[PDB]
């Protein structure tokens, strides 16, 4: 079987980007945020405290004929935003894009933090980072991704996801339409239940490549890229007039300034983020200070690789028994 899903960008910047889901019986479509940096499935549903709602589609299991609580189990997430959700859980058909997982866990919130109340396009989240990560207690739960991976032509999914437009998410095959070039792949560790790979270097505009080894995930539910102090600081030097602001929190740059391209390595190959991806526009409506698309990690305790980085390629998550990433130029 495969699968493929059109995703879109929520707002004019990109900050996020959701994916029509299929749960239940008759389907009740929810927007997702598919994301690579978690393993929880869960969704907005008429379980959700009313104060907690505004605007989201919400999952209603009593309406499936399919659903079936999953007695005793809850969960709860917290994120590398400070965003955080819990609930209970049900189990239900739900598909993406054509492909059916049957008995897929569907965490039910009760209660979601204000970002999650505040952003009325995402109907929740649907996690593809490694099933270790999952918090339903206390039987954890298999992502869709491992749910669908034996049903799969190809134990695979990939990501396609646009500068300022739609793109694709794609499961069981490679659609080699969707890219140029040839795809480089890069070992994978597990030990921490992400996609964790090492880039090989970095350059800044048309400057020199550094050759350094930088650890990180490839997070597709993190809006900005995150990187090194070195690294961010060697980049923003390179844009008149940025600096970082402890009161905006991160890097700051004119808004009338042009940016240069960031290049990061896999392997051999080179990935280059145009300029234009790396600007996130002002930091309140109507201000000449934009806000910076590369942002130090010093404070996270991990580099990510997120959609700033991650739109400039086609990105290749292969669950083989020995996982590996493949980048490609698109």
Do not use: M
């Not at 999952?59 to 809850?74: D, E, N, Q």
């Not at 209660?111 to 009325?120: G, L, P």
């Not at 739609?166 to 597990?190: C, E, R």
């Not at 650890?215 to 940025?242: K, R």
């Amino acid at each position: 079987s495969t699968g493929s899903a059109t995703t879109t960008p929520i707002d004019s910047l990109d900050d996020a980007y959701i994916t029509p889901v299929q749960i239940g019986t008759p389907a009740q479509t929810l927007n997702l945020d598919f994301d690579t940096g978690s393993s929880d499935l869960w969704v907005f549903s008429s379980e959700t405290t009313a104060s907690e709602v505004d605007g989201q589609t919400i999952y209603t299991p009593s309406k499936s004929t399919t659903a079936k609580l999953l007695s005793g189990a809850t969960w709860s997430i917290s994120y590398g935003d400070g965003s955080s959700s819990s609930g209970d859980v049900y189990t239900d058909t739900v598909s993406v894009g054509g492909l059916t997982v049957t008995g897929q866990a569907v965490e039910s919130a009760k209660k979601v933090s204000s970002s999650f109340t505040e952003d009325s396009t995402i109907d929740g989240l649907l996690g593809l980072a490694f099933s270790t990560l999952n918090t339903v207690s206390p039987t954890q739960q298999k992502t869709f991704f491992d749910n669908a991976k034996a049903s799969l032509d190809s134990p695979v999914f990939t990501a396609d996801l646009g500068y300022h437009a739609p793109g694709t998410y794609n499961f069981g095959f490679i659609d080699t339409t969707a890219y140029t070039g040839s795809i480089t792949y890069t070992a994978v560790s597990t030990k921490q239940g992400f996609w964790e790979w090492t880039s090989t270097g970095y350059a800044v505009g048309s400057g020199t490549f550094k050759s350094t080894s930088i650890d990180g995930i490839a997070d597709t539910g993190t809006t900005l890229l995150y990187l090194p102090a070195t690294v961010v600081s060697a980049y923003w030097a390179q844009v008149s007039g940025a600096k970082s602001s402890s009161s905006v929190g991160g890097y700051v740059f004119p808004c009338s300034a042009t940016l240069p391209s960031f290049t990061f390595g896999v392997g051999s190959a080179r990935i280059v983020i145009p300029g234009d991806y790396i600007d996130f526009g002002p930091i309140s409506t109507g201000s000449s200070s934009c806000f910076g698309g590369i942002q130090s990690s010093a404070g996270i305790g991990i580099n990510i690789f997120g959609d700033v980085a991650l739109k400039a390629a086609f990105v290749v998550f292969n669950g083989a028994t020995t996982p590996t990433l493949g980048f490609a130029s698109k």
